[PDB]
Amino acid sequence: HARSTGSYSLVTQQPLGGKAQFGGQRFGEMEVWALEAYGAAYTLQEMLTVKSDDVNGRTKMYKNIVDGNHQMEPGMPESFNVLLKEIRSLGINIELEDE
């Protein structure tokens, strides 16, 4: 199996196979610990941000990919954002501060 950029999931924006075009491989907690141990920071960021969960990140990446510029403008993963809304839906006020 293989995939570059496929269809995604509605609830949480995440890679999902629609066409039997197999959704991306799962990157688990251990698989994260490996990158931690190595100390590859950007590999990790892009792994859980721009290559997966970041709704803007994915496309803003792809554009730079074809343009020959290898970079990332990561932003915030939709998982955490969804969690912000879910928590703040309760009587809990959770804000992002400073600058």
Rama region for 98: left / alpha / beta (φ>0; ψ in -120 to 50; rest): left
**Shortest reach from residue 20's CB to other proteins, in Å:** 14
Rounded (10°) angle between helices 29-38 and 41-48: 150
- Out of 18, 19, 20, 44, the residue judged to bind other proteins by CB under 8 A: 44
Q: Does 18 bind other proteins (CB under 8 A)?
A: no
| Binding flag, residue 5, other proteins (CB under 8 A) | yes
> What letter would DSSP give residue 4?
S
Stretch 79-98: interaction string toward other proteins, x if CB under 8 A? xx-xx-xxxxxxxxxxxxxx
